[PDB]
Amino acid sequence: GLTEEQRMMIRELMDAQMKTFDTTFSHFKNFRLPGVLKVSLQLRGEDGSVWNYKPPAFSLLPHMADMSTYMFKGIISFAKVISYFRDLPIEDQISLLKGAAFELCQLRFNTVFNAETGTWECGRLSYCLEQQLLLEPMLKFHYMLKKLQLHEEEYVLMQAISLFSPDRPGVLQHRVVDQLQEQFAITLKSYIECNRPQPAHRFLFLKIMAMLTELRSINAQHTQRLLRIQDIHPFATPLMQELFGITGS
């Protein structure tokens, strides 16, 4: 059963989620495009028209970097609006964000992902996959997590656990961030047993937990893959530089 302290956590968590997550990507514009994986782009005009992009043979980097910044921006507003986060030392908020930005983005990106059609529905924008080449970690992750069929509560809770990780470079309040994370995980574990008594959801809390661990490694591996592509062909935005620790030098 959920305590009133648990109900209160989920609430202030769901609230921040609806206040900082533009599920129809309305305010995302002025973004770069490929000019003139295997992801095809689709842009449904406000007027009914449609612009479709098929890839060649890069090129889609600038755009993906703009989508990422719009996403990161939301994720940050998400953190600063949660009491538990706001009450930490400034330095620790930056350490935590730089730590989970990628993970929180992918967690949100998974909710607009369609496993049936293999596409990310982002408002008027669409990212379609061009099929057992889930040989791609990030890809198998989206399908696996999408398969679990989680509720919004579970997703925002996963976002909490990931955000408040004590095991992150430069985290000063190592102890607080840890207790907080334990509290979020407890609330999750409880929410599951209070609302999903069916056999199919047995071990759900643990699958979720393992998922967040996999996601942590994927995050480590992608950061590297990204910093390598950035070294030879700069594309990262000012905000991404700040997140991935680039000095502009």
Which residue numbers belong to the known binding site for hyperforin? 68, 106-109, 222
Nearer to ligand CDZ, 186 or 229 (CB): 229
Query: What Cα–Cα distance (Å) separates residue 157 from each residue in 24, 100, 237?
Result: 21, 14, 28
- Range in contact with a second copy (rule: CB under 8 A) among 41-49, 100-108, 203-211, 218-226: 41-49
For residue 106, the minimal CB distance to a second copy (Å) is 26
For residue 117, the minimal CB distance to a second copy (Å) is 18
Nearer to a second copy, 46 or 116 (CB): 46
Binding residue numbers: 68, 106-109, 222
CA dihedral 206, 211, 214, 220 (to 10 degrees): -130
**SS3 category, 41:** strand
The partner in contact with residue 146, picked from ligand CDZ, a second copy, none with C-beta cut-offs of 5 to 8 angstroms by kind, is none
Q: Which residues, 189 to 208, sit near a second copy by CB under 8 A?
A: none
Q: Which two tokens stand for residue 160?
A: 């909490």
**Closest among 169, 191, 106 to 140, alpha carbons compared:** 106
Query: What Cα–Cα distance (Å) separates residue 78 from each residue in 105, 160, 171?
Result: 11, 10, 19
For residue 56, the minimal CB distance to ligand CDZ (Å) is 14
**SS3 category, 14:** helix
Question: Residues interacting with a second copy, by CB under 8 A?
Answer: 34, 36, 43, 45-57, 59
